[PDB]
Each structure stands twice: as C-alpha cells, then as structure tokens.
C-alpha cells in the first residue's frame, strides 16, 4: 500500500534512540572504518605552525538497530537517512587548533545489514611541526590523528576502509597547481593511553608534502645574482676616480634593503634562520670584502701631501712579482734657482704620487682577478649543490 | 470553511516524512534540474588559488508526496512551503574549500504536480587552477561542479533547467565594474565513478573570466618608461663630469626598489614568474648595459698620470671611421731649460689626456646613439606585441 | 481569571501555522511596507567594490490570522509575539555579496487588526559600482534593492512605510564623523521580470554618499608641494658646483619612492587611474624637465679640454638679447718664449671656459625664471580648479 | 517525596509561555534594571571609528509568573532556570555596527518573588566619534546606549541596578596594561522618541577612555630629535667642502621616508591631520631652511671664474659688524712681463675668491648660531607645552 | 529482552529535567572537578594583549539523578549520554575577550554512581598582562580562571581532578616547535566575592610561557653587527678623500631605515620600548659619534685659503704627545722677484695645508683607535650580559 521507503523509515526510525551506542551487547565496540583522501592544501603557515587542508572523508560503522530484511520492503537494499536521526560517532582530530568551516552533509546511507556510510568534506586547521631548515626545498611531515574524543577503545575502535597501500597511492583528486605538492598519505594505527584501562584508538594519517622551489628562484637568486654582477661591473671604475667608494656603498645599501625586504617572505622557526641564510650572509660578506678592498686601494692611490716614496720592498714585490703573475746676473741666477726648486718639489710630489698610483693599479687588478675567481667558485659551488638535489 | 492555504498545508505536511526521498517507487531517481547564474566575482586569489563568486542559483525536482488537485482547495495551483518541512537534495560543489556565508531562503514553491522550486543565493569559495602566465591579459577557466555528495546516480540525477546555450549567453545581472570580466558559463554533464556501481552525477559549470589589463598599465608601464626616459636624459652628462656614474647607480637603485616593491602585486604560481617578468628583466638588463657603457667611457676619459699616448690603431679607427659614421749666462740657460722641461712634461700629459678624452667622447656619442636605437626597437617591439593582442 | 496577555497568546498562536502565507483568500498578496534609515557607513572598499553599511530597518504587513477584538482581552490593542512563532516574509537584498553579522530581534509587534510590525538592525555588505574618477571628491551612488527572493508579485508586494520625500530627508541618526558623508536615501519602486508571469516586486534605495576630501589634503598635496619647493631651493646651486645633478637625481628618487608608496592608498578600478594621476604625472614631468635643464646647463658650463670658443651667433644671441630680457741671449729668448706660449695656451683655455660658463649662467637664470613661472601657473591652475569645486 | 528543585521547576515551567511579557496587568511595564562594568578595551580603531570592548553585564526584572512560596518547596528561595525556558527582554545597544562574539550563559537566577537575574559577558563592537585632534594625548568619549529594540517605554523600561556614582567609581576588574586607560563609566537615562506615543527608554553609559602617550614617545619624538641632532652635526662641514649639500639632501630624504613611513601609524579623521602634524611640518620647515641657507652659503663661497671683487658695502657690513657681533734684453723684458701678468691675473682671481670665501664663512657662522638658537627655542617650547600637560 | 543500553537510557533520561541542578538536597553544591592540559600556544599578541591557546579540558561532577544499579542492566557500569540531554555546568573563563572556535563534543560519560565525565577541547582567546620589558628573553605569566558565571559557591564549587603538582608537571601533549615554550601550568583555588553572601568559586591556572630568543638573533644582532663592521671598514678612508662624509651619511641612512623597518616587529606596551631599545639607541649614538668625528677631522684637514699656520700649542701637543702615544737688468730682476713671490705664496699655503693635514691624520688615527676600543668594549659588555643569562 504505502511507499516502500516510507514504510522502511517508519520501521527503522520509530522508537529508535539516537543517544545510545548501537550495540545489542554493550561489551562489543563499534568499529568505525574511516577513509581519507586529500583534495587540496589551502595554506601552510610556518609562523604559527598550522596546516590548512581540505579532505574528502568517509566512515562506516555497523548499526545493529538499523537492520531489516529487504523482502518485506519491496526488495529495498539501502536508503538514505538523515544524519540527525541516528547515532554518529564523535571522530575528530587531535591536532585541531581551529575548527574548520566545512559543509554539513545531512544524509547518510544505511544498508539492510546495518552498515551506515557517512560521507563528509572537512576543512582542517591542524597544528604541525614545520621544519624550514631546507626552506626552498623542504619536505614537511604533517600528521592527522582521527580518534573518538570521549569513547575509549572498549566503546569505539577505528580501522581503515581501504588497505594502507591504496591510501598511500592516492593522488587522484588532489589540486596540484599550488605551491605544495602532495607526496603520500600514510595511515598507521596506534593506541593512546596514559592509564591502565583508558585506552583510546587512533589513526595517524602522515600527510607528507613537498614545497615547489620554482616559486622562489626568481624572488631569491635573481636579485642576488644581479647585485653580484653589478659589483663586478662597478669594479672596473678606476680607484682614483672618486666615484668607486660611492658606487660600492650604494650597492651595499641596495643589498641591505633587499635583505630586509625579502626577510618578510623568509620564515623563522625554533631552528632560527633557514640554511639559505648562510648563503645570503656569504654573499653579503663577499660584497663587504669588495668594499674593504676598494677602500684599501683608494687609501693606496689617494694623492696627498704626506706621501713618501714607495718603499723598495713593496716596489720590488708588486712591480716585479705581481706584474709577472699578471753682479746683478748672480741675483738673476738666484731667482731662477728658487723657481726651479719650487717646480722640482712639485714634480717630485707628482712623481711619488704616480708611483703610488701605479702600485695601487697593479694591486687593484690582482685583487679584482682574485675576487672574480672567488665569485666564480661560489657560483659553481651553488650550481653543483643544486644539481645533486635535482 | 477554513482558508484554502491552511487546508492545503494541513493536507500536505501532515504525516509527511522529510527524511525520505520523495519517490513512490524507490527505483526511479529524483532528477534535480539545476540552473546557475553568476552575479559577481568577489575575489580571485592566485596565491592560494581560490575563486570567490556570488551566484544566483535555482533548482527544481519532482516531489511525489506533495501532490494535490487544485479543484479541492479553491483552485490553488502553487503555494510556498518552508524549506525545513520538506526533503531537499544535498547538491553542493566539489571544488569547495571554504563554505561561503550566504543568506538562508526559508521558503520554496510547490506546484500541484509536485514540482518543488528552490531559489537561493550562494557565495562560493572554490579551488581553481589559475594560470598567470599572461598575468596582465590572462583569461581564467574555473569550474563549478554541482553534485549530490552522498547519493549516487541511481538516487539523485542532475540536469539543466535551461538549454546550455541559454546558460552560456547569460551576462544579465553580472556586476561588471570590477577587475574581472565574465565571458561565459558553460555547463556540461559528467558521471563521476571510481567503482563499477557507485556512479555520481555531476554538472560542471566552466566559469571563464578575463582580467581587465587597464588596472595595471599605469602601475607597470609608467614607472619603467619613466625610468628609461630619465636614463636617456642622464646619458647627456659628459663622461668626465664625475656625476654620470653616481646618476646611473642611483637610477639602478631606484629601479631595484621599484622592482622589489611591485613584486608584491605580481602573483607567483607553479609556473613561476609571469611572461612580463622577462620584459622587466630585459629592461633591467638594458639599464645594466647603460651602466657598463658609462663605466667603460669613464675608464677611457679619466685623466690619470699613467696614461700613455693613444695607440695608432685606436686613433685611426675611432677618429676616422666612427667620426665619418657619425759664464753665468750658461747657468741662466740651464735653469730656463729645466723650467721649460717641467712645463713640457705637464703639457705632454695634458695633451695625452685630451686625446684620450676626445676618443672617449666620440665613443660615448656612438654608444649613446646605439643605445637609443636599441631602446626604440624594444619600445616598438612591445607596442607591436600589444597591438596584435588588442 | 487568567492574565489578558496569556489568554491572547493562547487564542492567537494555538492551531496557527507559521509556514502558511497569512491570507484567507490566496489571490491577494501580502503588502510588506518597507522603511530604511542609515545608521553608519562602515566601509567603502573600491578594490573589491563592496559597500558595508549599518541600517535601521522596519517593515509591517497585515496578518489576517492574528486578529482579535480588544474588548474580549481586557482592552489590549497590541502585544509582542516571538518572530519564530509567526510567518515572516523573506525580504532580502539583491546586491548582497556577503551576509552581514547583525543582532537577531526575537519579538515583533502585533496589532488587534493584524498589523505585524518588525524592527531589526541590518549590517549590509552589498556590491556597488564605485566610480573613483574623481577620487578625492567622488560622489558614490549605491543601491539597496529590497525584495522577496522567492515570492512573486502575486504573493508578496513591497511599498513604503513613509512617503519617499520623508525617506529622502532622513539624516538624523547617521554617524557623521567618518570619511563618508551621506547625502540622501532615495527609494524607488520597480518590477523585476524576465518572464511573462514571474514578476518580482522590488524597492531600490539609492544610497548616495560623498567622500570627505580633507582626509587626503595633507597626505596628497603636502608632499608634492614640499618636493616642488625643495626643487626650486636646489635650483639655486651653481651649475658648475658638481652637486646640482646629484641633488636633482636624489630629489627624483625621493619623488619616485613617494609615488610608489602613495599608490597603495590610491584606488584602482576599471577606469584605471583617477583624475589626480594626471596631476601627479604632470608634477613628475616638471621635475624631469628641471633635471633635463640642469643636465643641459651642466653640459654647457663643464670645463673640458675639447671646448672651442663660443660661436658668434650664440654669443650675440645670449649675451645681448637674453641679458637685455633679464749668442746665448738668443737661447734665453727661446726658452722664455716657450714658457710664455705654454702659459698663453693655458690662459686661452681658461678664458674659453669662462666664456662658456658665462653663457651657461645666463641661460640657467633665464630657464630658472621660466620654470618658476611655469610652476606658479600650475599652482594657480590647481587652485582655481579647486575653488570652482568649493 | 520528589526533590525540592524538581518539584519547583515542574511548578514554574509547566504551562508557562515564554513568548508572553510576564505581567498579570498588561498596563504596567517590566522594569529591567541594567548594570555594566568594563573588563577591557580590546581595540579602538580610529579609521572606521568603531570601539571594541568586553564588558560584564547583568540585568534583573520582575517575572510575575515565576513566583512561589518557599515553605512549600523545602524552604528554597532561589533556583537556576535555563535562559531559553523563560521570557528574556531584547536589550541591545544602538551603537552596534557588528554583533560581537560573546559566550552564551544558559542559566539565570529566579527568586521566590519573581526577580530574575541574568548575568552575561558581552563583546561590543560599537560606533563612536573618535576625535584625534590631540592624538598622542587624546581622551575619547564613547557612548553605549542599552535599550529595548522593539518595546516602547509602556512595555519595557530601564533603570540602574546601582547608583550612578557607584557605576562611575568602578575600575575594579578593568584590564589596565593596554594602550587605553579607562577613566569612568557614566550612566544617564534618556527617552528616545520621534513620535507622540512611541517613546523608547534608553540608558547611555558614557565610556571615557584616555590614551597612554608613552607608546608613542620613542616612535615619534626620538627619530625627529635624532635627525635634528645629525642636522646640527653635519652643519659643521665647511661650505666649500663639496659634501655639505649632499649631506643636507640625504638628511632631507631620510626625513621624508621617515614621515611617509610614520604616517601609517598616524590616524586620520574628518578633522584631518592631528595637532602634532603642525609640529612635524615645522620640523620639515626647519630642515628646509637649513638646506636653503646651506645652498646660499655654497653660492657665496663657490669659486668660479665670473667672481667680481666683494662690494664695499657687503665687505664693511659683514667683516666689521657681523664679526663684532660674533736689443734682445728688451725682448727678455717683454716675456717676463707677460708671464708676470698671467701669474698676476691668476693671483687676483685667487684673492677675490678668498675674500668671497671669508665673507661666506662669517655668514655661515652667524647663520649657524641663529639656527641653533631657533632649534633650542623650538625644543624648549615643546618641552614647556608638554610640562603644562603633565 | 531489550538491549541493556536502550533500557538504561530509557530508565535514566525519561522524566529527567535537564534544567534542574541535580541535587536531591538543594543545600549541597555540585563540586565540578576541573583538569586542564595545554596543547599549543597559537598566538601571543602583545599589541592587543590577548593570548590564544588550545587546551584539552575535562571535568566531572556527581549527577544524583543518573544513578542505577549495574545488576539490573546486564552489569553495565558506564554509558555515553548526549551532552544536550543532561544538566551541564556553566564553567567558563573570566579572561575571555573573544569566544573561541572549538569543536563540540556531543557525548559525555555517566557512571553507575552518577559521575558524569565531560571531555572537550577549547580554543581560548584570553586577555593577559604581557610585559615585554625583556622582549627577546621575556617570560610571560598568563592566567586562566575557570569559574561558574552565574552560580555562587553555594551552588557550584570547583576542585581539581589531579593534584596540583601533577598539573604543574604536565608538558606531554604540548606542541613545542613554536616560538613560545611552556614552562608550567600552576593551579590555585580562590574565592571571588564583592558581597557578603555572593561568593563565586574560582580556579586560576597560571600559564607561564617563555619566548625562544633564537627567532630574533639573526633579525636583530646580525644587521647591527654588519653595519658596525662596515662603519669600521669605512673608517679607513682618508679624511681628505672627499668620500668619507658621504659614506658615513649613507651608512646612517641605512641604519635609520633598518630601525624604522625593524620597529614593526618590535612590540610596544604601557612600559614603552623594551630594554633592547636602549642598546639600539646606543648603537645609533656610536654611529653618530663616528659621523661627528669624521666631520671634525674633515674640518681640520680641509684645504682652504683662510688656513693659518698650525698654532704652537696644538703642533707640540699632537705631533709629540699623541705621536708618542701611537739698467734693463734691474727690470729683469723685478719680474723674477715678483714671480718668485707668487710661487712662494703658493708654496707657503701648500705647506700650511700639509701641516694641518698631518695634524688631522694623527688625530684621525688616535680617534679611530679610541672608537675601535669603545666598540670592542660595547661588544664584550653585550656578550657578558648574554652569557650570564645563558
Ligand atoms: Cl579519489 C578516490 C580514490 C579511491 C576511492 C574513492 C571512492 N570514493 C568515491 C566517491 C567518494 C567521495 N565522495 C565525494 C564527492 N561526491 C561523491 C562522494 N568521498 C570519498 C572520501 C574519502 C574516500 C573516498 C571517497 C569517494 C575515491
Ligand atoms: Cl538573469 C536571468 C536570466 C534568465 C532567466 C532568469 C530567471 N530568474 C528569474 C528570477 C530569478 C532568481 N531570483 C533571485 C532574485 N529574486 C527573484 C528570484 N534567481 C535565479 C537564479 C538562477 C537562475 C535564474 C534565476 C531567476 C534570470
Ligand atoms: Cl530616525 C527616524 C526617522 C523617521 C522615523 C523614525 C521612527 N523610528 C522610531 C524608532 C525606530 C527604530 N528603532 C530602533 C532603536 N530602538 C527603537 C526602535 N527603527 C527604525 C528603523 C527604520 C525606520 C524608522 C525606525 C524608527 C526614526
Ligand atoms: C476553478 O476553475 C474551474 C475551471 O478550470 C472553474 O470551472 C471553477 O468554477 C473554479 N472554481 C473556483 C472556486 O474558482
């Protein structure tokens, strides 16, 4: 007479108590078989160390009160029942630090043997230990522990819907265009107990994710390489030009502002600075060494009245070794003698300055070649370090 | 006696089960016809790759229990019934990453043959693949897949209220003053199944949106063009003025700070930098080439005591080819001879410096003209690339 | 016996159906009279083009089921009834893009003839077309369309509680200390229909708001005027000082950083830059013209060994028209003659440089006067454009 | 037999209507006595002009239906009753612009004579007029108007739980470590009516809060004082050194970037800039005056070939008043005469330059002393303005 | 016949009033035993002075109505009962300033003797007094006061589930990779009463947390040390080079921008600046002292025409003590005499300038050594202050 679904719902949900764990014998637990597949990784925030993810979640447990024989209800084998009308286990995540905003699924599937199937999408904001030591290339290992918050293992136990290898091999629906690439989701069963009897079942889903370094190549290497190139370009200025020191200090100011700006994107954790901070401070040290060498050569070549003739040891060393590696008439006479003496003093000062300038030029050329070799060695070291990672 | 609407509501909603799928025969699914119209695009966030939109959404399905004959109820053909009092399908979007804040519509229309019509606005925060390769002029292709989360295709199926061409041609209520211009909404039906029997109906609305580049013309082209113009202006400074290198390095510092500031607005995805990053680094390379040319010409013209006379080959080459392309009396004699020799040495140094300065000036003019031609060629290349897009 | 209010509530809310539109005859619509007064304008966001406002909103409709005679209930003419216990129309706003957070008013007034009065505060986040073409002085025109989302005009119709002139003249409770000044709220009734029969009642409240420009005078005009003043101040440096070009380029760098910082506060829409962007680029062009003049005068006055005597045409033109507008003894002779020739060459070079320096000084004074006149003309043009707006 | 509390709850809440105002005679209003004490001031946001506060709030009203005699119920005089089970007045705040997130208190106390006591914490986001004219030392006067949103004064009236002096003297639980110091909370009863009969009771709690200026001393005065100090330090550079104008312009650029950075923390309202903006622009004026006077002295002392001897009036004025305030032999003769004439011209130019340099040095010393006195006067004026405030 | 759990739930929750405090004798209070473990410290915000934490919270109280004998219900000793079906105490925290978003646990355990056990996670946003006086090394002392909001001590009283030493020793589940390290959680019972009879039970959990300074070593010491190092590097430039003052002022500008950028990360409270602000301003003062020394030496060594010979006292003092610490023929004669006099004047000026330059060089070396010693003393003082903390 009446529709089969209406009769079945009247048979099931009438005189049914949704606050009772659905077991005829209270000594057996309800085994909630859960399953998790990752849809997207919305945000990994290394400052507060929380991971935002969206997962598709499904679980099923045996409801010993929602059972019927199909033959009495027009051969119906399954029907959808509202989630509010039946008992639902309190499975949530330990690592929660903020309840997510996820849609509510109002219906669940019930089979004729009691297997209630619940599908639900979840937005998860969970705490995790984010090790940024290898920041551009770091691989993170975040856990998602599903468990019953109140019920012990004697009341609610948790298993897997699918074999752990199948869970590990899932990368199907994952949104992959973002910064973070999902490697694997590894499930593992554990019992959490700090008491002899109070044992709580758990299911740890180790979400392992890898950052894509292509986001940061242009943002990190390009400015540093650009400034190191313009350092070599500015090296060509003659030391006595009077513009070299200004050029170098302006370049150092530019590098300083670049560093203090890019530090906003560079994360910081209990480890401190990441590994690439060492490379950044090495580049800054190279620039400082360039500035110091420029100042030294400026000190050498600067013409000033206290300059004494170049010492014999320095003259020999630089200009050979480093070069190889690379009566009224009597009154008239007195006036001319005095004028000649003045001009001779001026010329002697000029020649001493010229000798010092030559020594400074040779040393500047040698130190420029040494600095260029050091920069090339640093660049090839970085290239080989990147190559063995690729 | 009683009002027609009260009697009709008593007839319908009494002994009516809202947890039962409204089919007299459980073998036929409820076909939920779906219609979606985009009202606005609130935010396209390429960093986290989520799309925020507001859509007007309506659906209708046949409720076989909410049926009556009009003649018994004062010829009423339709009435408004609360949403909470009837069965409502769980149609929601797969691409959800955050449940939106949308008003709740409490009433739905029910016709005398069971057609229940539901109208509701929806704020959607959905994941999408945002390709910013053509960032100023990129056109995005975001999908909105409506499906029943729990029910399979044997329970709930999805069709279109209107023909797909009519859905595609809809641009009526779209808020259009914003940054993003809606091109079309293209619906197309898929079955999603990773099981032999568990098939889920789906309806993908491909929301295709195009960015308006007028937001970024002033923010991008204007600073680069302005700095290129001032570079050409500063080219006019004489190479021996002692201010040209400072001008060039200050301009390079200004361009560096401009780049590191504008990089906050430039998005970054798994692709890396957008295509216009190539143009930006080409402009920076042109500035660096200008700086290198300035430093080289300064090296040539800088007067210093180690300068030797201009070599014959360079003198000929530059100053012809490039120019075409463009007794106490004896004691008195000795002192005068010495003074003349000092002045002769000074004059010879001055004349050698003058010859080198002439060579440097000619080369500076030639290289300035070459750089101007290169800048003009780059500008017209950019203009002709923009023209074929417009 | 019993209290009058208890008996009245028992008479009304018993056997009362809150899901039924309250009309004894279903052919007549329920006319919901709408009134809106604005409390404050919380935020106008020209980037996403959404308007956040707080309004005091009230409506009243005739409830044909909540009617009684006062004489039976101790002469009670009105009572407060919970909003959840009676039918409430679904009046909301089309322009919604985000449901606001507003307090829920649990009670409504019911009169003895069925007039149900509903008072409720509303926080509205609505989309609007924000034209920033006159950004400092722009007047915005944002609509608020109240309508029944589901019900057609045959079911729910909308009127005004007060005449449109009274609504237009309301500026009483409006919080006025903020950036935005409310001019008027203009109501207008319209029918929205894209079908022959499905006509929906609407009531558009055109909220017209005006920005207060005093927020931006100090933030916008003051830096530009200050940098223009220091430009004229630094213009006085002698062209041959060797510091004028550095001063000018430092000033241009300061203006560039000021522009790229203030661009964060300057909004951008589909129009592009606002009108004051033209004024800003004009000021930047004036600074660039000053820099170019400085470079030209430096080119003229710069002392270098390739300088030739000032041509007759330029000498006449500038220095008249522009100024008006503003034997061993024979061996002794040879050495003296050679020394005199050296000194004569040096003096000739010095005098040619002096003549060029004089020409450059006169041209610098003339161009300074021209530039000062141009700056004054620009300032008075801006002042007279502001005056006609005031 | 049964527990006293169970019997009392059965006696009270059975056949009790929570939608009815608890009065046996509908002509008497329910007097809701309000009491408010402030716990903390979470955020004062002068941009959007909203005040965020957390208050402890309690109210009590006479419920004429929740009355019993203690002797019948084991001498119980009060019991806790759920909030949802009884009538609760709709007391909320007019100044609301955003409903706060506050915990829900489920229970209220009911006395044997009907006095129902409701305790609840409230987070309040309310609009206020924030006058920032004295930004570092401003005192704010924000109101909190508690009133019934729907009920008129004939239905719900509002009084004070405690005397207004006791409310004014409350500073007990206030969290005081923050930026804002609470002075007093002043209650005042008003009637709000824009109709002859529709009068609404109100209770205005004038929350008066004072900002602690110690937050801003280091952030505001210290950079300005430091830049003034380095201005005086760099003043000592000789005017002809060639570095003074570069120093001054670099300092002005530093002050400009400091101003445009600190403007992010300086608020802006309809008043415009605060009062300390005048002091900041005075500091900018002093720096610009220093720069202009430096340029003037550079103009005086700059050695150039067009210099004429110092005029008698300027020489006398400065260097007295301001200083007090502070045959082949004939052919031989011709060559010697020509050489002497060249050297004499050079010496005359050198001496004229020396005289101009002396005049410039004396004027520079005088203007340095004048500028130092002006800076000291400004500093003591600021100190004496701060002292009368302290 | 029926399942034991169903019969037990029917026995318990039938005719059970969830709004009644569960005591057969109303004179006894319900002692709620509270236990708390900190899971993580999500955010410590010293600006608004709120502490965001996630805690695991459990409580148990005696329910005198949910009591049964196990032998009547198949030896069941405990069962899970929904939280909504039973009376739950209103325990919340005084220090709340924003209700947290925490998951809702629907079930609680009930034992056969009435012990109802409630487990729940809690996100807490609580006010606290954050003293930043020792900012990089500060240890905070935040309190969490759990109490019943409405109920007095005669109705609800609070104890500890575990002994206070056990609570103090808990650091098990705490997420420890973040910036803040948890030291201890110290519980302490207090009574809060501002009335003779209205005493409220309270329980304060003093959460003591310590910041990890390793976050800020690279962000604070590294830039300051780098700029101090480049200050010493630029100290080597000769004072008469003409680049030393530009170098020093550029370095000071770099330090100024570094300070005004790092001030965004440095917090500010009612105390004002933290203690390390003194160290920062001391470093800036050292830089200013270096700049003043450079300017003084530039004043000494600057060659200008008004230089008089070095005074005897200064010559002796510096160059000894500080060095130790570290007829037509008659017409021919007249012209020669005049030329010799000109050259003699020039040479005398040159020699006076040389003497002043020597004095300036010696003083520059002495002051460089003094400044280096001062910098070393400051560095070792900072190191020895850090060592006694470590
Ligand atoms: Cl990608 C994949 C890989 C293996 C197995 C499955 C099975 N499956 C089918 C559908 C479906 C699922 N739905 C969400 C979207 N609407 C239909 C139901 N949520 C799920 C949540 C967790 C685990 C599996 C599933 C799932 C899928
Ligand atoms: Cl723009 C357009 C173009 C063609 C057809 C229609 C039909 N239509 C009429 C009204 C209406 C609609 N409402 C929202 C505003 N209050 C009245 C009901 N929501 C809708 C949501 C999705 C699809 C269609 C509609 C719709 C519209
Ligand atoms: Cl300013 C003004 C101007 C004209 C008419 C009125 C009448 N009026 C009186 C009170 C009141 C009103 N309430 C909110 C505050 N608690 C009492 C009720 N909300 C309203 C919402 C919309 C329109 C009118 C009103 C209104 C006022
Ligand atoms: C209903 O409509 C029919 C026509 O279909 C008409 O004959 C009949 O009179 C109508 N009844 C009422 C009550 O309007």
Numbering used by the authors:
A (entry chain B), B (entry chain C), C (entry chain D), D (entry chain E), E (entry chain A): 8 to 333, 397 to 460
Sentences reproduced from the published study:
The structure possesses the typical receptor features: a pentamer is organized around a central pseudosymmetrical axis that coincides with the ion pathway.
PZ-1922 also displayed a high affinity for human 5-HT3R. Purified mouse 5-HT3AR was subjected to cryo-EM imaging in the presence of 10 mM PZ-1922. The overall conformation of the receptor closely resembled previously determined inhibited states observed in the presence of other classes of antagonists (e.g., RMSD of 0.7 for Calphas with the structure bound to the antiemetic drug palonosetron). The central 1H-pyrrolo[3,2-c]quinoline group is stabilized by hydrophobic interactions with F199, Y207, Y126, R75, I44, and W63.
